[PDB]
Amino acid sequence: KVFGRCELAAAMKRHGLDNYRGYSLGNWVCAAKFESNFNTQATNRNTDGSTDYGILQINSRWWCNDGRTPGSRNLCNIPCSALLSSDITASVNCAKKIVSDGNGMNAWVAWRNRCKGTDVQAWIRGCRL
Ligand SMILES: [Cl-]
Ligand SMILES: [Cl-]
Ligand SMILES: [Cl-]
Ligand SMILES: [Cl-]
Ligand code: NA
Ligand SMILES: [Rh+3]
Ligand SMILES: [Rh+3]
Ligand SMILES: [Rh+3]
Ligand SMILES: [Rh+3]
Ligand SMILES: [Rh+3]
Ligand SMILES: [Rh+3]
Ligand SMILES: [Rh+3]
Ligand SMILES: [Rh+3]
Ligand SMILES: [Rh+3]
Ligand SMILES: [Rh+3]
């Protein structure tokens, strides 16, 4: 599913991402835009053989099992395919674990390079939140 911007904002808010670990909703929407273009089915192979999955491009190196990332972990205790669902629950729950792990949203390289220090509030402007 390809979310609308405000549609995704509303779902992220309902699932408790607004101000989670101090990150305002616009941070999460901006991250999703540049990670996946709001597409839950987005996948991307990393150089090390791991793969990023879903609207927040969660990596199989640490967070989910895809059966083809040798030596990797599954810290969210989910198949990576769960991260491709039209329902964003699994991605949100796993994102909460990632953002809590020490480096905050710097875990998402696209957030660090394209969202951090920008006017992220712009990403939720106009939405009935
Ligand atoms: Cl947009
Ligand atoms: Cl914001
Ligand atoms: Cl694996
Ligand atoms: Cl932080
Ligand atoms: Na894994
Ligand atoms: Rh808010
Ligand atoms: Rh708030
Ligand atoms: Rh990657
Ligand atoms: Rh890499
Ligand atoms: Rh496995
Ligand atoms: Rh397996
Ligand atoms: Rh399995
Ligand atoms: Rh649901
Ligand atoms: Rh839902
Ligand atoms: Rh502004």
UniProtKB/Swiss-Prot annotation:
Subcellular compartments: Secreted
Biological processes annotated in GO: cell wall macromolecule catabolic process; defense response to bacterium; defense response to Gram-negative bacterium; defense response to Gram-positive bacterium; killing of cells of another organism
Domain C-type lysozyme: 1-129
Superkingdom of origin: Eukaryota
Enzyme class at the top of the EC tree: hydrolase
One GO CC annotation: cytoplasm
Pfam families recorded: Lys
Location of the active site: 35, 52
Organs and tissues of expression: In the egg white and polymorphonuclear leukocytes.
Swiss-Prot/TrEMBL catalytic activity: Hydrolysis of (1->4)-beta-linkages between N-acetylmuramic acid and N-acetyl-D-glucosamine residues in a peptidoglycan and between N-acetyl-D-glucosamine residues in chitodextrins
Disulfide bonds: 6-127, 30-115, 64-80, 76-94
Alphabetically ordered keywords of this record: Allergen, Antimicrobial, Bacteriolytic enzyme, Disulfide bond, Glycosidase, Hydrolase, Secreted, Signal
Gene3D superfamilies: 1.10.530.10
EC numbers: 3.2.1.17
Residues the record lists as binding substrate: 101
Classification via InterPro entries: Glyco_hydro_22, Glyco_hydro_22_CS, Glyco_hydro_22_lys, Lysozyme-like_dom_sf
GO molecular function, one term: lysozyme activity
Note: Lysozyme C is capable of both hydrolysis and transglycosylation; it also shows a slight esterase activity. It acts rapidly on both peptide-substituted and unsubstituted peptidoglycan, and slowly on chitin oligosaccharides.
Subunit field text: Monomer.
Function: Lysozymes have primarily a bacteriolytic function; those in tissues and body fluids are associated with the monocyte-macrophage system and enhance the activity of immunoagents. Has bacteriolytic activity against M.luteus.
Family membership noted in the UniProt record: Belongs to the glycosyl hydrolase 22 family.
Protein's name in the database: Lysozyme C
Organism: Gallus gallus
